[PDB]
């Protein structure tokens, strides 16, 4: 949506590490820039080669 990540205003490496472990822990395909359906894209994808490889199970 409207929310957009915010860099640290800290100085010293352990403000970055802090807020690095502050992060929301939700991260989606947006985050890289990408698309926010590429995540789905690729749970299809991965869907498909499990459908696959059962298949080459039998």
């Not at 802090?18 to 789905?40: H, I």
């Amino acid at each position: 949506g409207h929310k957009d990540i915010q860099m640290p205003d800290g100085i010293r490496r352990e403000e970055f590490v802090q807020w690095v472990e502050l992060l929301p822990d939700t991260q989606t395909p947006s985050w890289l820039g990408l698309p926010n359906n590429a995540e789905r894209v690729l749970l299809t994808t991965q869907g498909v080669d499990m459908i696959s490889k059962m298949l080459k199970m039998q």
